[PDB]
Amino acid sequence: MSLEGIKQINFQSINVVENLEEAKEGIPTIIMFKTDTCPYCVEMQKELSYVSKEREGKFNIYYARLEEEKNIDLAYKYDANIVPTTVFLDKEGNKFYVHQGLMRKNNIETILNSLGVKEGHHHHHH
C-alpha cells in the first residue's frame, strides 16, 4: 500500500514484481501495462491480490509502468497501447493471450489456467 515507497509498495501485491529486472523465468509471467497515473491499475491490483490468495507461488505479476524506458520496447513487444494491457505468458514467457481492458479475478485466473502455469511447483501442501 502507500507506505515506505522505496521498495515496499507491493504490500498488497503478492507474487508480483516491480520490473522484469526483478522478474524471473520458469513461473509464468503476466504483464500488465499501466501509465503513471491510472485508477484502473489499483482496481486490477486488488483483483490480482485475490488471485494470488488462491494461487501462492505459481506465477509472477509484472506491473509494467510506462514510467520507464524498458517498457517502451516492452510495450510494443506485447501489443500494449491501452491501459491496462494484460498479456498472459506461459512459463518461459510465451505470449499467448493479450487483453486490453479491465477484468476480474475469475477471468484473470481462467486465462492463467489457459496458459498452463506448469512451473511454480513449489507450493506448500500445508
Choose among 117, 105, 96, 126: nearest CA to 28. Answer: 117
Q: Which three cell numbers stand for residue 24?
A: 524471473
What does each C-alpha distance from 113 to 19, 48, 60, 69, 118 come to in angstroms? 23, 14, 14, 31, 9
Question: What's the longest Cα–Cα distance across the chain?
Answer: 41
Return the CATH number at 88. Answer: 3.40.30.10
- Reported in sequence order, the residue ranges of 1-126 that DSSP labels E, i.e. its strands, are 16-17, 29-34, 60-65, 85-89, 95-100
In the chain, the number of structural domains is 1
| CA gap 123, 126 in Å, rounded | 9
- Give me the residue label for grid cell 488462491: 54
Say how many C-beta atoms besides its own lie within 10 A of residue 9's C-beta.
Answer: 15
Q: Where in the sequence is the domain holding 92, given as residue range(s)?
A: 1-126
**Method by which the model was determined:** NMR
Handedness of CA 38, 75, 26, 5 (dihedral sign): negative
Closest CA to 85 of 73, 74, 98, 96: 98
How far is the C-alpha of 10 from the C-alpha of 1, rounded, in Å? 7
Residue type for 63, please? Y
Query: 100 forms bridges with which residues in the sheet?
Result: 85
